[PDB]
From a paper:
Following this pattern, the type 1 pilus usher (FimD) and chaperone (FimC) help type 1 pili assemble into a composite pilus structure consisting of a short tip fibrillum made up of the adhesin protein (FimH) and two minor subunits (FimG and FimF) that is joined to the pilus rod, a homopolymer of ~1000 FimA subunits. This ability to transition between a coiled, helical rod and a linear fiber has been proposed to allow the type 1 pilus to act as a ‘molecular spring’ to maintain adherence in the face of fluid shear forces. FimA is critical for proper assembly of the type 1 pilus and, as the major subunit that makes up the pilus rod, is also critical for the proper display of the FimH adhesin.
To characterize FimA polymers that form the type 1 pilus rod, we solved the cryo-EM structure of native type 1 pili appearing in a preparation of recombinantly expressed Type IV pili (T4P) from the E. coli K12 strain BW25113. The FimA reconstruction had an overall resolution of 4.2 Å, which is sufficient to build an atomic model of the structure. Overall, the type 1 pilus is a 70 Å diameter rod where each adjacent subunit rotates around the helical axis by 115° and translates along the axis by 7.7 Å. Further, in the structure we observe the N-terminal donor strand of one subunit completing the β-sheet of the adjacent subunit. Most prominently, the hydrophobic amino acids Val5, Val10 and Phe12 in the N-terminal β-strand (Nte) of one subunit are inserted into the next subunit’s hydrophobic groove created by a missing β-strand. Within the cryo-EM rod FimA structure, residues 25–29 adopt a helical conformation and residues 30–33 form a β-strand interaction with residues 10–13 from the Nte of the next FimA subunit. We can explain this by the fact that Ala22 in our rod model is tightly packed against Ala93 from another subunit and Val37 from a third subunit. Pili formed with the WT FimABW25113 protein require more than twice the force to unwind than the pili formed by the FimA BW25113 variant with an A22R mutation (~30 pN vs. 11pN), likely due to steric clashes caused by this substitution affecting the tightly packed interface between subunits.
Numbering used by the authors:
A (entry chain I), B (entry chain K), C (entry chain E), D (entry chain C), E (entry chain A), F (entry chain B), ...: 3 to 158
Write the structure that this text describes.
Amino acid sequence: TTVNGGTVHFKGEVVNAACAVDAGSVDQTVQLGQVRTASLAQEGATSSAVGFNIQLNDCDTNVASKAAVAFLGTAIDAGHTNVLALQSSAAGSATNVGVQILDRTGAALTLDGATFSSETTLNNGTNTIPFQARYFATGAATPGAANADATFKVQY
Amino acid sequence: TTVNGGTVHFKGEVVNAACAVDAGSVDQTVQLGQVRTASLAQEGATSSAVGFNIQLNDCDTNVASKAAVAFLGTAIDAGHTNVLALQSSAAGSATNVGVQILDRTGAALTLDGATFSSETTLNNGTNTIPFQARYFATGAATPGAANADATFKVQY
Amino acid sequence: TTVNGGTVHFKGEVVNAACAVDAGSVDQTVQLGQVRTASLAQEGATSSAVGFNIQLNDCDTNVASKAAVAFLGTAIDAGHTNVLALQSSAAGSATNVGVQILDRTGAALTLDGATFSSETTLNNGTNTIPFQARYFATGAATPGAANADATFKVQY
Amino acid sequence: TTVNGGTVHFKGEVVNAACAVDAGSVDQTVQLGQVRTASLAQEGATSSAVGFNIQLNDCDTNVASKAAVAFLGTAIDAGHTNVLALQSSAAGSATNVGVQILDRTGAALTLDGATFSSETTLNNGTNTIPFQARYFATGAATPGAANADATFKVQY
Amino acid sequence: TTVNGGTVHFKGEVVNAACAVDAGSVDQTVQLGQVRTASLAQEGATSSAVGFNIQLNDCDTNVASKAAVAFLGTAIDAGHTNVLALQSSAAGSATNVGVQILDRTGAALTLDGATFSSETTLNNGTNTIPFQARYFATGAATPGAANADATFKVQY
Amino acid sequence: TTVNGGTVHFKGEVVNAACAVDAGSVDQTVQLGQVRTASLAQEGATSSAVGFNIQLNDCDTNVASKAAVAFLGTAIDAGHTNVLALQSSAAGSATNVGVQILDRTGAALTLDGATFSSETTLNNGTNTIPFQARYFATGAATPGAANADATFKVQY
Amino acid sequence: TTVNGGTVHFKGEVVNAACAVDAGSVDQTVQLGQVRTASLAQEGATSSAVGFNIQLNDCDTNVASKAAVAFLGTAIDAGHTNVLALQSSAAGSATNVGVQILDRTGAALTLDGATFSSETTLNNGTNTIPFQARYFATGAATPGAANADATFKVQY
Amino acid sequence: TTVNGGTVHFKGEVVNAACAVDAGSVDQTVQLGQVRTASLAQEGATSSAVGFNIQLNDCDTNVASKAAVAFLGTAIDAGHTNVLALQSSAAGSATNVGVQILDRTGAALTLDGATFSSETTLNNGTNTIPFQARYFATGAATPGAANADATFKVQY
Amino acid sequence: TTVNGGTVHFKGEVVNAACAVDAGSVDQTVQLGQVRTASLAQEGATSSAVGFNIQLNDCDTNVASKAAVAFLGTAIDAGHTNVLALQSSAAGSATNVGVQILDRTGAALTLDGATFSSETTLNNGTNTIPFQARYFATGAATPGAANADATFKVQY
Amino acid sequence: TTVNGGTVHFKGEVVNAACAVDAGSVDQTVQLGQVRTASLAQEGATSSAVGFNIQLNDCDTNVASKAAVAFLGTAIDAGHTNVLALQSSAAGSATNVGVQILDRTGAALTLDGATFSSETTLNNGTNTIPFQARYFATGAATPGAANADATFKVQY
Amino acid sequence: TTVNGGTVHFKGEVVNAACAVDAGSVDQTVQLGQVRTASLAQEGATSSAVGFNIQLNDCDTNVASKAAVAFLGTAIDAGHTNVLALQSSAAGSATNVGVQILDRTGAALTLDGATFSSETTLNNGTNTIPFQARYFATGAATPGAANADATFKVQY
C-alpha cells in the first residue's frame, strides 16, 4: 500500500579551494532588531550593533592558510560605498538609511565583490569569521520596515 | 584565488518611539512541552503553565515611561476571544483545544491587535515584559501536534 | 564584448488607500500538507488546520485605522458558501471536499468579494492579518490532489 | 498500451563569452508589491524599494574577469531616460508614474541597450549582480495596475 | 447594461488508460539557460544539465502499475538519433549542436515515438517522471539562439 | 540602409461601461489536461475540475458596482443546456461528452448569451471572476481529442 | 497504402543587411484589451498602455551596430500624423479615436515609412526593440470594435 | 424581419485509411522569418532552421500502426531534388536559393510524391510528425521575397 | 513617371436592420479536416465535429435585441432535410454522405432559408453566433473529396 | 495513354519603372461587410472603415525612391469627386450612397487617374501602401447590394 | 473604501492511508553546503554528510504500524543506480559527480520509485524518518554549482 508524497530539493556547491563553506552559515539569517530614528536620524549615525558569523569546515592551510571576503549588493550612493541599501516590497521600507557591516577589523566593507577583507588566519579544519551588523544612516530616517541582502564572495 | 559563497539576509525594523525591541525576543521561540488530555479535556481546563519573555533596549521614558501590548492571531471562537488557535499542517494537530497567554497581571489577552495589556513601567535602557503560556481547552481534546503563532503589537 | 541576456518582468500595483500590501504576502503560497479521508469523510468534518499570513507596510491610520477583507473564488455549493473549491487539472483532484479559511475570529468567510472580515486594528507602519487554512468536507471524499486559489479583496 | 501526451518546449541560448546566464534569473519575475499615491504623487518621488537578482554560472575570468549590463525598454520621456514605462492592457494601468531600477551602485540606469552598468567583478564559477526595483513618479499618479518589462543586455 | 467581452478557448484530451496527464506538465516550458561554445564545441560535449518534470494524477495501478515514454521530434542525424534539433526562425539559431534529454536512468532517449523509456513504477493517484535536459554538441557550435520542441508519447 | 520587415496587427475594443476587460484574460487559454473514460463514462459524471480566471481593470463602481456574465457557445442537447460541446477537426474529437463551466457559485451556466451569472461585487480598479472548468459527460465517452470554445458576454 | 493530405505554405524573406527578423515577431499579434470612452473621450486622451516587442536574431554589428524603424499605415488626419486608424469591417468599429505606438523613447512615431525611430544599439546575435501600444483619441469616441494594422519598416 | 447575409464555404476530405488528418495542420502556415545572404550565399549553405508540425486524430493502429509522407512541389534542379523552389509574383522573389524540409530523421525529402518518409510510429488516437524548415541555397542568393508551397502526401 | 497597375474590386452590402454583419465572417472559410469511412459509413453516423463562428458589429438591441438564422443550400434528400450536399467538380467528391451544421442549441438546421434558428440574445455592439460543423452520413460512404456551400440568411 | 485536359490562361504585365506590382495585390478583393442605413443615411456620413493593402516587390529606389497613386473609376457627382459609385446588376444595388477610399494620409482620393497620392517612401525590395475603405453617403440610402470597382494607377 | 489585493494559492493532497505527511517536510529544502574536489574527485568518494528529515502527523498504526519510502529522480548511470544527478541551468553545474541519500539504515537508496526503504516503526500520531545527504562522486569532479531534486514516494 504505497502512496505519493512530494518533491525534495537539495542544494549546495562544488568549489576547488582551501576551505569549504557551511553555506547555511552564509545563507544564515539575522534579526538585527527594531531600531529608532530617535538615534538614527543623522548623516553618519551608527545605531548600536549586532553580531554575524561565518563557518568554514575541513580546511587545508597548505592550499591557503589565509582568507578574506569581498561583498557586493545594492549600495545607496557613490559617497556611501560601504553602505547596503534595503530590499523589501515597495512603499514599505525606510529611507535616508542603509546598513553597515563591520569586518573583524571593525571595517566598513565595500559592496563591489572585489574589496577583499582582512586576511583571516586559517587553522586546519574549522574556522569562524564574525562580522558585526548595524545601521549607518544617511540623514533623518523614515520609520520603515528594514530588510536587506548581500552576496558573500570569498578570497583564499 | 577567490571563490563564490552565497547570499546573506539581514532583517529588522525602524520605528520612531520610546523603546526599541530586540526583535529576536519577539521572534523568540518557545517549546511549551508535551501535554496530556488526561487533564486538558474540559471546557475550561488550564494545563500547567510556562513562561515567556520580551526584551526592550535603550529606552527613553520621556517619550513614554510606560508601555503595553495587544496581540492578534487566529483565535478559535467568538466566545473564546482570549484563546489562540493552532497552525500546523492539516490533519495533524489537535482539536477542542487552543492556547492561552497570560499578562504580567495573569490576564487572558484578546487576539485583536487592539486589546492593549497593562501599562508596564519603563526604566531608562532595558526592560522585560514576561508572559506565561499555557493551553486553555475547549472540551475533550484530540491527541495532536501543537503549534501556534501570534503577532506582537505594542503600546507606548 | 557585449552579449544578449533575456527579458525581465516586474509587477505590482498603485492603489490610493490607507495601507499598502506586500503583494508577495497575498501571492504567498501555502503547502497545507497531505490529508486523509480517514478523518475527512463527513458532511462537516474539519481536518486539522494550518496558518496563513498577510503583510501590510507603511500604513497611515488616519486614512483608515481599521481594515478587513472579503474573498471570492469558486465555491462549491449554495449551501456551502464559505467553502472554496479546488482547481487542478481535470480527472486528477479530489471530490466531496473543499477548503475553508478562518478569519482572526475563527470565521468561515464567504467567497463573494463583499463579505468583509472583522475590522482589524491598524497601527502606523506594518501589520499582519493571519488566517488559518483547513479542509471542510462535503461528504465522503475522494483521494485526490488538492490545489486551490482565492482572490484577496480588502476593506479599509 | 501506449497513449498520446502532448508537446514539450525547451528554450535557451548559445553565446560565446566569459560567463553564462541562468536565463531563469533574467526571466525571473518580481512582485514589487502594492503601492500608494499617498507617497508616490510627485515629480521625483521614490517609493520604498525592493531587491532584484541576477545569476551567472561557470564563468572564466580570463575571457573577462569583469562584467556590466545595459538595459532597454519603453521609457516614458526624454527627460526621464532612466525610467521604465508600464505595459499592461489598455485603460487599466496607472499614469504619471514609471519604474526605476538601481544598479549595485544605486544608479538610475538608462533604457537604451548601450548604457552599460558598473564593471562587476567576476570570480570563477558563479556570481550575482543584484539590482533594486522601485517606482519613480512623474507627477501625481493614477491608481492603476502596475506591470512592466525590460530587456537584459550584458557587457563582459 | 450588458457588454461584449471576447472568446474563450479550453483544451484537453480524453484517453482511456491507467493514469491521466496534467497536460500542462507536458506543455510545461523550460528555460535551460544561456550556454557557451567555450565548453560546447566538441563532437560529444555535454553542457551542464537542467531538470524537467512530468505530472500524472488519479492513476489506477490495476490497469497499469507501470509506465514509460517514447519521444519523437526533429533529430539531427542518423548517427545522433537521441539528439533533438532546434526550431527557431531561420538564420537565427545555432548549428553543430542539438539537445539531449535524459531519462530517470540517465538515458539518451531516441526521437522516434517508439523508443519507450524505463518502466516507471506507478502508485495510486499521482506520480512524477523527471527528465534532465542538456545540450549534446555535434562539433564546434555556432553562437545562436536555442529553441526546441519534442512530442510526448507515453506507454502504460 | 533601410530594409523591409512585415505587418503588425493590433486588436482590442472600445466599450462604454463600468469596468474594462483585459481581453487577454478572456482570450486566455486553458489546458484542462488529459482525462479518462475510466471515470467520465456516465450520464452525469463530473471529472475532477480545473480553474479559470477573468481580469477587469480600472473600474468605476458608480457606473456599476456589480457585474455578471452570460455565455453562449455550441451546447450539445436541449436537456444539457449548461454543457459546452467540442470544436476540433472532424472525425478526431470525442463524443458522449461535453464541457461544464462553474460560476463563483459553483453554478452550471447556460450557453445562451443571456443567462447572466451571479452579481459579482466590484471594487474600484481591478477585479477577478474565477470560473472552474471540467467535463460533464453524456454517457459512455469516446477516447477523443478535447477542444472547445465559448463566447464571453458580460453584465454590469 | 498511401493517401492524400493537402497543401503546405511556407513564408519568409531574404534580405541582405545587418540583423535578421523573426518575422513572427513582426507578424506578432497583440490584444490591447477592452477600453472605455469613460476616459478616452477627449482630443488628446491617452488610455493606459500595453507593451509590444520585436525580435532580431544572429546579427552582425559590423554591417550595422545600430538600427531603427519607420512605420506606415493608414493614419487619420494630417494634424494627427503619429496616430494609426482602425481597419475592421464597415459600420462596426469606433470613431473619433485611433491608435498610438510609443518608441523605446516613448515617442509618437509617424506613419510614413520614413520616420525612422531612435538608433537602437545592436549586440551580436539577438536583440529586442519593445514598443508600447495605446489609444490616442480624437474627441468623444464611439463604442466600437477596435482593430488595426501597421507596416514594419526598419533602418540599419 | 429577416435579412440577407452571404455565403459559407466548408471544406474537407473523406479518405478510408488508418489515421485522419486535421487538414488545418497540413494547410497550416509558417512564417520562417527574414533571412540574409550574409550566410545564405553558397552552393550548400543551410540557414538556421525552424520547426513545422503535423496533426493526426482518432487513428487505429490495426489498419496501420505506422505512417510516412512523400512530398511533391516545384523543385529547382535535377541535382537538387530535395529542394523546394519559391512561388511568388514574378520579378519579386529571390534566386539562387530554395527551401529544404527535414524529416524527423533530419532528412532532405524529395519533391516527387513517392519518396515516403521514415515509418512514423502511430499510437491510438492522436499523433504529431514534426518537420523542420530551412533554406538550402544554390549559390550567391538574391535579396528577394521568399514564399513557397508543397503538397502533403502520406503513407500508412 | 506614372505607370499602370490594375483593377480593384470592393464588395459589401447595405441593409437596414438591427445588427450589421462582418461579411467576412459569413464568407469565412472552414477546413473541417480529413475524415474516414471507418466511422462515417452508416445511415446516421456523425463524425467528430468542428466549430464555426459568426460576427456581428455595432448592433442596436432596440431595433432587435434578438436574432436567428435560416440556411438554404442543396440538401440531399427529403428525408434528410437538415443535411447539406457537397459541391465539387464532378466524378471527384464522395457519396452516401453529406454535411450537418449544429446551432448553438446543437440543432440540425434545415436548408430552406426559412427555418430560423434559436433567438440569439444581442447585446449592444458586437456578438458571435457559433455553429459546429460535422458530417452526417447517409450510408456507407465513398472515399471522396469533400467540399460544400450554404447560404446565410438571418432573422432579427 | 494520353488524354485531353483544357486551357490555361496566364496574365501579367511588363512595365519599365522603379518597383514591380504583385498584381494580385491590386486585383486583391475586399469584403467590406454588411452595412446599415441606420448610420449611413446622411449627406456626409462615414460608416466605420476597413483596411486595404498594396504589394510591391524587388524595387530599386534609385530609379525612384518614392511613389504614389491616382485612381479613376465611376464617381457619382461633380461635388463628390472623391466618392466611388457602385457597379452591380441593375435594379439591385443601393442609391444615395457611394464608396470612399482613404490614403495613408487619411485622404479622400479623387477618381480621375491623375490625382496622385502622397509620395510613399520606398525601401529596396518590398513595400506596402495600405488604404482604408468605407462608405461615404450622399443622403438617405437605399438598402441595396454594394459592389464596386476602381482602377489602380501609380506614380513613381 | 475597499481595494484590490491579489491572488492566493493553497496546496496539499488528500490520500487515504495510515499516516499523513506534512508536505512541507517533503517540500523541505536543504543547503548541503559548499564542497571541494580536493576530496570529492574519485570514483567512489563520499564527502562528509548532512542530515535530512521527514514529518508525519496524526497516524493510525492499525491501518499500518509500519512505513518506508522509495525515491525516483534523474540518476546518472546504470552502474550508479543509487546516485542522484543534478538539475541546474545548463553549462553551470558540476560533472563527474552526483548526490547520495542515506536511509536510517545508512543505505544508498535507488531512484526508481519502487525501491522501498526499511520498514520504519510508526507510533500513534507523529513520527520522523531522517535521511542523510551527501555527494557520491563518479570520478574527478568539476567545480560547479550543485542543485538537485528527487521525488518522495512512500510505503505504508
